[PDB]
Design a protein around this nucleic acid. Structure first.
Lengths: 138, 558
RNA sequence: GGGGCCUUAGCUCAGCUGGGAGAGCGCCUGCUUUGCACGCAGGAGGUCAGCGGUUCGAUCCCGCUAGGCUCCACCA
RNA sequence: GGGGCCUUAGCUCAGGGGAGAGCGCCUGCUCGCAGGAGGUCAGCGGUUCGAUCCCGCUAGGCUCCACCA
RNA sequence: GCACCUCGAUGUCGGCUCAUCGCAUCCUGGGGCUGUAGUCGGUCCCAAGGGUUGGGCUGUUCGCCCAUUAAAGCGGUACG
RNA sequence: CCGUAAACGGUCCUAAGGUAGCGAAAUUCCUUGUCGGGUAAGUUCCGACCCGCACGAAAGGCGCAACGAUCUGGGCACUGU
């Protein structure tokens, strides 16, 4: 459960998700990670589900780096009301994720353990995923 | 006991002690005890009007009846109607056990209207009823009665007060001997019961004392003794004392010649009733306020004892299971023939030179090998049981020791103490759900003695309050209160006094020369993860004391 | 048909997430009470709806059968 | 669900410069006194030098509506 | 939710009568897996051919109950 | 509002806070309240519990013989409803 405890504004515009990832494109903390291929809002509930799904299967191993944070709130007008008459109340928090962005980072385990943990994380996410690793040119 | 003659003496003493006066405060700390704070001539007085089912009494108390809880509605109406007024006179309605209080109380609107407060002490029919002394309707009663339950003398607010049934007896005092002897009519020897049911306000104790003062029962010998006793009572001649033969106590305003026992004579009836109910009243109060907690602890102790017996049954089932495992091994070393429906097959001895009689094992129709394998599994479960049931027996004896200690600490505890026991048990999760106050004593040499009554008070007292070189006392191998002396050096007399206090506040209260141990508080530790309230110690010294009540009452600081 | 909560002493009901079954009313025994049906302790009653799996012990966990409440939308 | 009024001692209620009564508990004093235990002022966060006092919100308690097919 | 069609009229609930259509199938027919010993079952397939009730309560649909049945199935057709 | 077993006590407020008698009503959202009767089955009816959103004493309260082209339940006879 991730959320900011204080915000400058409680109601914000929904924004746009055009283009690739501005940052967080390359894996640089862990050894393996998930690279996003499509853009959608990722709810903190989905982030918690993916984190528990990785952490349970990695009961012995390193820690998980969560590269995304749900800083943008979304508002939800109450049901069965007419359109307009003011913006509704904020309901939850989402993270704006663009294609190419690294979502979660794992180091300190084997190859197949990391692949299966990332598959179990990816089956909870609403986006198409792929497996990436660190490249050492370099 | 507190009969009509006793009431006669109590009315005389209250007329001597509290005449006029002002009732500053009215407190009802318990369900049946009402405290009047009389400001009479001289110093302040504390009048107690008790309507207990067995311990009902009226006397001027002197000890501090603590725990002033939120007052019930009878106490609030007493403070609304009686406080601020004066007491006109205290008189007895004839010779029966009826107390009349004439209250010259100013009304709340400013004018004056006399109120009559009626105190009845009839054992389990005791009640306190206030009337307005002009129409004699019941303003309120301590115990509210229905027109159905106790149909005669209904006690309701606004109902006209009615008096208790007449006993059909003559007035015993000022009565002529001829009168007294012309109606008892002794024929076959029911003499004491004849005095009881023929003579107003006479306890059976006074009848049994009178039949001993008469000596040989006779036509004139008995009557003369009774007349002399009644004349002395009328002359206000009283010798209050405490006499007992074995444990259970008796009190009267006259010296007792019969039932000879330790006789503790008193100066007045006030100190007599203060010393008598000193233990019984306190015991009947923490019992009536905490019967559910002690019932729960006793029931759980019975559960734990039944658990230990049924765990020892499994400990015998351990030795039973080994024979089954041996039978399974024998079946295995022979299970190559008669596999189909195999039972009562003779088995040749595989172990020992005994060559014991061929065995005939009986097996169910699973498989000839799975029956022996089932026996071997039962054996593995049996050895895991040997581990776990011994662990459970150890835990159950620890629980029984802690619950016996909790029984001890609840049995000798005051109102506040038993409530603090309640909080402790709920914290324990046993009961479904800050610098506290303690009890202190002052010794003969001015040394302060602190007594912790509950384990929540005891752990705080042992780890926060007392400094170094403070002598800590506890009863040897018997649960009791933890007593600490806050002085650098304890006088031998101080140690003796604190040991008597620790023996009195113990399970050995009704014992003689009970063992007590004393040591410095630096030498006591407690383990981590164990049950709270467990204190262990080493390098202690032992003295022998007798737990008498007198010393504890004398050593009060308040 | 879909979800949920229970079947516990003669009655009304607790029992904490497996550590060994109880409160009140009700029926008896004994004590006590001068007197107005005002008090105390001690006993029973339960296969915890019925059966069989788990583990060292099951109301509690599990599967399979009898039962009772809730919970579900109109409308003009 | 939408407006309006409150959440203050154990109970009931008054009240920008640092907050109180009656009842309930005590304290010595012979129908009234002079004093003490208990207050996250329901909680968060902004404006300044400080908030019970001003504000945006969360739970709670009252009052008035939730009508036309 | 919106207000696109009708305010120089598109009669709106529940029942009666007459039906028709789609299976996301209530039974009947044919199967797979079952922790399916047999009867009875559970789940998932193929299948609309036919049939899918008489009452008490309430205007009621719905719902509860009584007695059956092989079952008393969901919906659409201007909530036919 | 808060306690205490209608009734009493503490506090705010007003002019004072519902007496007798009725009560799930031509009045009750929850709600087909609970129990019993009537039927095999009764959201209607009848008799009690008060838990009266939001009965109540001449905009009268509670009963009441006879009466009604009145309303709501239940039986006998009777029949194509």
């Amino acid at each position: 459960m991730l959320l900011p405890k204080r915000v400058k504004y409680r109601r914000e515009h929904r924004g746009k998700m055009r283009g690739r990832a501005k940052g967080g494109t390359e894996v640089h903390f862990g050894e393996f990670g998930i690279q996003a291929l499509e853009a959608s809002w990722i709810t903190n509930r989905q982030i918690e589900a993916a984190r528990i799904a990785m952490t349970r299967y990695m009961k012995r191993g390193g820690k998980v780096w969560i590269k995304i944070f749900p800083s943008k709130p979304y508002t939800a007008k109450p049901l069965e009301v007419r359109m307009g008459s003011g913006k509704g109340a904020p309901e939850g928090w989402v993270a704006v994720v663009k294609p190419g962005k690294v979502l979660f980072e794992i180091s300190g385990v084997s190859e197949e353990v990391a692949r299966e943990a990332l598959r179990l994380a990816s089956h909870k996410l609403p986006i198409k995923t792929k497996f990436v690793k660190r490249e050492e040119i370099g | 006991s507190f009969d009509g003659m006793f009431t006669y003496g109590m009315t005389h003493e209250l007329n001597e002690k509290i005449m006029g006066g002002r009732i500053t405060k009215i407190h009802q700390p318990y369900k049946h005890d009402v405290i009047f704070h009389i400001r009479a001539k001289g110093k302040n007085q504390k009048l107690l009007l008790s309507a207990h089912p067995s311990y009902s009494r009226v006397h001027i108390t002197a000890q501090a009846y603590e725990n002033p809880s939120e007052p019930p509605m009878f106490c609030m109406l007493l403070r609304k109607h009686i406080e601020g007024g004066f007491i006109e006179k205290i008189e007895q309605a004839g010779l029966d056990r009826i107390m009349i209080f004439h209250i010259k109380s100013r009304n709340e609107i400013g004018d004056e209207t006399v109120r009559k407060l009626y105190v009845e002490i009839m054992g389990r029919h005791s009640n306190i009823i206030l009337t307005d002394a002009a129409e004699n309707v019941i303003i309120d009663g301590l115990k509210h009665l229905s027109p159905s339950m106790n149909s005669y003398r209904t006690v309701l607010p606004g109902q006209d007060y009615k008096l208790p049934p007449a006993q059909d007896k003559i007035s015993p005092l000022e009565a002529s001997e001829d009168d007294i002897l012309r109606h008892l009519s002794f024929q076959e020897g029911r003499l004491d019961k004849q005095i009881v049911d023929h003579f107003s306000g006479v306890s059976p104790l006074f009848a049994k004392e009178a039949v001993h003062r008469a000596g040989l029962a006779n036509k004139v010998t008995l009557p003369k003794a009774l007349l002399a006793l009644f004349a002395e009572v009328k002359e206000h001649r009283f010798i209050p004392n405490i006499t007992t033969v074995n444990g259970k106590e008796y009190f009267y305003l006259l010296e007792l010649t019969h039932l000879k026992g330790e006789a503790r004579r008193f100066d007045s009836l006030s100190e007599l009733l203060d010393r008598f109910y000193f233990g019984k009243a306190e015991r009947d109060r923490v019992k009536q306020q905490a019967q559910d907690l002690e019932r729960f602890v006793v029931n759980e102790r019975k559960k734990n004892a039944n658990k230990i017996k049924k765990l020892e049954k499994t400990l015998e089932y351990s030795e039973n299971a080994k024979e089954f495992q041996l039978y399974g091994e024998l079946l295995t070393a022979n299970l190559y023939m008669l596999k189909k429906g195999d039972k009562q097959a003779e088995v040749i001895n595989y172990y020992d030179e005994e060559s014991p009689t061929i065995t005939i094992p009986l097996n169910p129709n699973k498989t000839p090998s799975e029956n022996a394998q089932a026996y071997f599994t039962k054996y593995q479960k049996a050895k895991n049981s040997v581990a776990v049931v011994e662990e459970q027996i150890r835990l159950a004896q620890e629980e029984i020791e802690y619950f016996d200690q909790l029984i001890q600490q609840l049995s000798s505890a005051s109102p506040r103490d038993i409530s603090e026991i309640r909080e402790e048990l709920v914290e324990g999760k046993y009961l479904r759900p800050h610098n506290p106050v303690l009890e202190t004593y002052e010794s003969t040499s001015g040394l302060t003695i602190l007594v912790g009554k509950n384990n929540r008070q005891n752990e705080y007292l042992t780890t926060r309050v007392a400094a170094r070189d403070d002598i800590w006392l506890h009863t040897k191998d018997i649960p009791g209160s933890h007593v600490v002396i806050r002085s650098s050096e304890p006088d031998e007399q101080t140690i003796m006094e604190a040991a008597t206090i620790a023996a009195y506040f113990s399970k050995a209260k009704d014992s003689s020369s009970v063992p007590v141990d004393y040591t410095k508080i630096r030498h006591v530790k407690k383990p981590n993860g164990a049950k709270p309230g467990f204190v262990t110690y080493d390098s202690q010294h032992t003295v022998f004391v007798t737990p008498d009540a007198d010393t504890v009452i004398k050593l009060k600081k308040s």
